[PDB]
Structure 1
Amino acid sequence: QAVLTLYAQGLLGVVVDSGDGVTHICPVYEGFSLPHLTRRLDIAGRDITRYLIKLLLLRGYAFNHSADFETVRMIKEKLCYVGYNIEQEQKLALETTVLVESYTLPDGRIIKVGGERFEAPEALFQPHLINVEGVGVAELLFNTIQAADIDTRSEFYKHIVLSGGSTMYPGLPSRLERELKQLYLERVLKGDVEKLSKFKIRIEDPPRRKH
C-alpha cells in the first residue's frame, strides 16, 4: 500500500500510515519500499480510544472499556485533535472554557469534554503516557530518514504523506512539522538556529484520500 499511496499523489517519498491496528512509516525511493529503514509505531486508533476512556474515567464518568468502547470511539472521531504546542493547549484548558464541548450519549445523558480532546491523541507523541516504549511517530519518522541515505534526505523531508484513519486528527500535519524541525535543529545542527529557515519540510495532508 505505501507504494500505491505515493502513487496516487503522483510521486515515486515517505508514507506515514495509521489505522486502528498499527502505524507504519514506509519510506519509498523512486520506485518502491525498503524494509531496512521501514519501521512500525505500535500505537494506533484503538490505543487512543483506550486512553480517551482512562481520561474520562478520571473526569468522573462511569465508562467501561468493553461496554462503551464504540461510544468513546465516536467521541474521539468527533472531538479529538492533535495539540500543536502542548504547553499552550494545557493553558487554554486550565484557564478558559473554549475547549469544552457537550456530547450527547446514546441514552441521551450529556457529558462535557475539554482538555481530554488533545491529551488522548498526544499518546502518539509521548507513548509513555500509555506505557509503550518508543519515541513517538515524530521522533520515529526523523530517525527513519536521518538514518537513511544522505542523497534523499532533502527529498524525503519535503515529501511526507499521511495516510489512514488515525491520521486525520486536526493539526496533525502541523505538529509533525514542528517536531521534525525541533529534532533537526538540535540533533543535526547543534542548535544553530540560523542555518535553519533553509531546512525544507512539507508534510502534506491530501483530501482525495478516501480512495
Structure 2
Amino acid sequence: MDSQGRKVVVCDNGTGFVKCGYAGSNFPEHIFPALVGRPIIRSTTKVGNIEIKDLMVGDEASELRSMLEVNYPMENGIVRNWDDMKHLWDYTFGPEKLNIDTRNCKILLTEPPMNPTKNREKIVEVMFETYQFSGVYVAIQAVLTLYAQGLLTGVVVDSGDGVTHICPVYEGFSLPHLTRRLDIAGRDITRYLIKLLLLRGYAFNHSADFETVRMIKEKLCYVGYNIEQEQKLALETTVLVESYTLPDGRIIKVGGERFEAPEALFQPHLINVEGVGVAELLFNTIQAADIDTRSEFYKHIVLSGGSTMYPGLPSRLERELKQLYLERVLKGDVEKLSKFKIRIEDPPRRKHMVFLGGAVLADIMKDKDNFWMTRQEYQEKGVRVLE
C-alpha cells in the first residue's frame, strides 16, 4: 500500500489450524495444524534411529504423536500456558510459517468477547518485551467476517472443532447483553463419537487414536438433508451403512455416526447432558430478534470458516425453520412460507476468509495510526494499547 507488501502480517489464531501471512497474501499463505509437542515415548521397540530433531511445532509435529509430549493447554479453545506459545511464536518467525521480524513492523490479530484480558495484557507486555511491533491491531473475533463485503446486520456465526459463535448484529453493533456463543465443536463430539466405536469392539486407545476421526472429518465427512426420511431408510434398508481403511490398513465399519454425530448439535441430550440444541437456541435467538430483523433474517444472517463449507445441513435447517415458525408462531398459517424469500448465506470464499476476512481491512488501514494500537501505549502503562 503506502509502503512494501512485507512488514505487516495477518493471522487467524484458530483452534484446528493457524492460518497466517504478510497482510494481503493470496491465502493465509502458510497454514498448519495448531499443534505443538516436545519428546516423550511411543515405540516400545528398537526402531527409528532418527537423530534429526527433538521438539516440534504444527506442520512438522504432525508425524510424531507420542514421540512428543503433545499439548493443547486449554479451555474453550482459550489457552492456559504462556510459553510453548512462545516457542511456537519463535518458530513462526522463520520461513517456517512467516519469514519476519516485528519491531520494525506491525500486525493484525483478534480477541475473544469476554477475554479475561489481564492475561492478554501480560502476553502483550511480553510481546512488547520481545516482538515489540511499531504498531499492532486486535478486534473481537467475529467482527472481521463482515470485511470483504462491508456488512452490518444478522447474526454472525462460526464453528469448527474447538468452539462455535452466535453474535446478534445490527448496523455493525453486536447486541452485547443479548449475545450468544457455544463453547465447543468437533473435539468432544469426537469423544462422544468414539464412545460409540468402543461398543462395536473398536475399543482403541484414544491417546494414539482420537485424531483419526479428524482425518476423515477433514478430508471426507458431510451432512445429508432429507434427514428424517434418511432415519427411516437407514434401519429399514440397512445397506446404506459405510466403512473405511484406517490407513494403517484396517477397514472398520461405520454407520450413520459419520453425520449422525451432528444430531448431538440439535439434541445435546444425545450425550445425556441435556439439550434442545443449537437449532432451538436459534429459534429463541430469532424470537428475541425484533419484527423487522427476524423477517429480514429469512435471507439476512451470516456464517464463517472452513466449518461452513458444508453440504445438506443448510437445506435441512431451512426445511426445519419453516416449521417451528409455522408451528409455534404462525400456529397454522402457511400461505407465505416461500414468499418469505429465503436465499442462502455461506459462499465458497468462507474457505479463505479465515484470514482474508481480516486482510480486506489492512488493504485500507496499514497507513492508519488511526487504527494502530501500540507498544508505546503498553510502555505508557496506558489503560489499553489503542487509539
Regarding TM over 0.5, the answer is yes
Query: By how many angstroms is 1:126 displaced?
Result: 0.9
Q: For the Cα contact (< 8 Å) 1:173–1:204, is it kept in 2?
A: no
Query: By how many angstroms is 1:147 displaced?
Result: 0.8
3-state SS of 1:201 partner:
coil
Query: By how many angstroms is 1:79 displaced?
Result: 4.5
Q: State the partner residue of 2:186.
A: 45
Q: C-alpha offsets along residues 112-146 of structure 1, whole Å, 9 cap, x if unaligned?
A: 22322221111111111123334222121222122
Q: State the partner residue of 1:101.
A: 242
Q: State the partner residue of 2:147.
A: 7
Q: C-alpha offsets along residues 143-177 of structure 1, whole Å, 9 cap, x if unaligned?
A: 21221222322222312222234434421211221
Q: 1:38 to 1:50 in 2, by over 3 A?
A: same
Q: C-alpha offsets along residues 79-105 of structure 1, whole Å, 9 cap, x if unaligned?
A: 433343433222332233564333111
Query: By how many angstroms is 1:52 displaced?
Result: 2.0
Query: By how many angstroms is 1:10 displaced?
Result: 4.2
TM-score normalised per structure 2: 0.50
Q: For the Cα contact (< 8 Å) 1:83–1:171, is it kept in 2?
A: yes
Query: By how many angstroms is 1:200 displaced?
Result: 3.4
Whichever structure has more helix as a proportion of its residues is 1
Q: C-alpha offsets along residues 36-72 of structure 1, whole Å, 9 cap, x if unaligned?
A: 3321223411132222212222333223333311112
Following the alignment from structure 2 to structure 1, what is the Cα–Cα distance between the partners of residues 275 and 266? Answer: 9
Query: By how many angstroms is 1:5 displaced?
Result: 1.4
Q: 1:177 to 1:123 in 2, by over 3 A?
A: same
Query: By how many angstroms is 1:30 displaced?
Result: 1.8
Q: For the Cα contact (< 8 Å) 2:164–2:184, is it kept in 1?
A: yes
Q: For the Cα contact (< 8 Å) 1:161–1:203, is it kept in 2?
A: no
Query: By how many angstroms is 1:9 displaced?
Result: 4.4
Following the alignment from structure 1 to structure 2, what is the Cα–Cα distance between the partners of residues 195 and 112? Answer: 45
Which residue of 172, 180, 189 corresponds with 2:330?
189
3-state SS of 1:16 partner:
strand
Q: 1:141 to 1:8 in 2, by over 3 A?
A: farther
Following the alignment from structure 1 to structure 2, what is the Cα–Cα distance between the partners of residues 98 and 6? Answer: 44
3-state SS of 1:57 partner:
helix
Which residue of 46, 51, 54 corresponds with 2:195?
54
Query: By how many angstroms is 1:189 displaced?
Result: 0.9
Q: 1:98 to 1:124 in 2, by over 3 A?
A: same
Q: For the Cα contact (< 8 Å) 2:155–2:302, is it kept in 1?
A: yes
Query: By how many angstroms is 1:109 displaced?
Result: 1.3
Is 1:73 the counterpart of 2:214? The answer is yes
Q: For the Cα contact (< 8 Å) 2:306–2:351, is it kept in 1?
A: no
Following the alignment from structure 1 to structure 2, what is the Cα–Cα distance between the partners of residues 97 and 77? Answer: 26
TM-score normalised per structure 1: 0.86
Q: For the Cα contact (< 8 Å) 2:193–2:261, is it kept in 1?
A: yes
3-state SS of 1:69 partner:
coil
Following the alignment from structure 2 to structure 1, what is the Cα–Cα distance between the partners of residues 149 and 165? Answer: 18
> Percent same amino acid among aligned pairs?
100
Query: By how many angstroms is 1:207 displaced?
Result: 0.7
Q: C-alpha offsets along residues 171-190 of structure 1, whole Å, 9 cap, x if unaligned?
A: 12112212222111112111
Give 1 or 2 for the bigger CA radius of gyration: 2
Q: For the Cα contact (< 8 Å) 2:151–2:172, is it kept in 1?
A: no
Highest relative contact order (Cα 8 Å, sep 6+), 1 or 2? 1
3-12 vs 13-22, which moves further: 3-12
183-192 vs 101-110, which moves further: 101-110
Q: For the Cα contact (< 8 Å) 1:21–1:46, is it kept in 2?
A: yes
Following the alignment from structure 1 to structure 2, what is the Cα–Cα distance between the partners of residues 164 and 58? Answer: 33
Q: 1:179 to 1:6 in 2, by over 3 A?
A: farther
Is 1:17 the counterpart of 2:158? The answer is yes
3-state SS of 2:235 partner:
helix
List runs of 5+ in structure 1 lacking aligned partners. none
Q: 1:20 to 1:150 in 2, by over 3 A?
A: same
Q: For the Cα contact (< 8 Å) 1:38–1:144, is it kept in 2?
A: no
Q: 1:58 to 1:88 in 2, by over 3 A?
A: farther
